[PDB]
Design a protein around this ligand. Sequence first.
Ligand SMILES: [Zn+2]
Length: 323
Amino acid sequence: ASAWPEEKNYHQPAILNSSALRQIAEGTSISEMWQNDLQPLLIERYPGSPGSYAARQHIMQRIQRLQADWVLEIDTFLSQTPYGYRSFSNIISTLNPTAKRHLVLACHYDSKYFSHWNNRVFVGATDSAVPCAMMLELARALDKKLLSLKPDLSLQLIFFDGEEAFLHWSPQDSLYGSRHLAAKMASTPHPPGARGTSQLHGMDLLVLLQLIGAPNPTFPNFFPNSARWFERLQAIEHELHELGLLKDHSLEGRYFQNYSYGGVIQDDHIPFLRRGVPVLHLIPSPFPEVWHTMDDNEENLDESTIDNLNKILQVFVLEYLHL
Ligand SMILES: [Zn+2]
């Protein structure tokens, strides 16, 4: 009986030096991300809408133009909703599908349904268009390094559909895509041909980004079994800061603060956490002031903060993968 699913417990990062850190900082472009990945997502995209379809096409297109060998899968299913049966489509983007272990980054690409109000449309800029754009920018910025993966560990990105409740949150009205994907991966043998391990045993760590893009975010350390990874984000932020690689940033107002949070926050990670998957939940506490209002738009996004977080995340990913 192989003990490979236990490898994640001991996996250590391969830390980048100063020179490598300046390279990562210089290799990501907040303006390119803004125009090529984010703006096309700032549209009404609740499940089943024409916008949902457009969002999904945009995401698959931006991934397909890259050199790395991404394998795209659309996981489509039906679920009961307050409005009756509906169709949903998760987008899964994987490097090295038969690779036993994967570091997983995720966000939801749907936008909460709201009828038009005084000609205003809800586009959920921080929730979660920016997290989506950040994942695409990461795939783009690290493309050359990720191409080299073509430790049986690789990378996977998941864009969940239907994270939002159609009405207000309830156990049955919310997290449609993730409750579905979690159960699916929990009952899918992995790697192919395996006798007793599933795709969930292969998830080294689930890094879920939500509500990112507002000013002064503060991310607490939610789980003891991922606490050492939270610490790495703290170390990275601190070193990028000391090297002068972040913009309009101070240690007093650092994003990753030494402090926990006992309460449960409902999000796409829940269905995975309840099946034993380690989670690093990158959601700030408190939530952006514009949370679930028509003001969660482009105008209220803090550009340098997103840029800083892009650098932190890309470094975290390269260190995890030893790239
Ligand atoms: Zn939301």
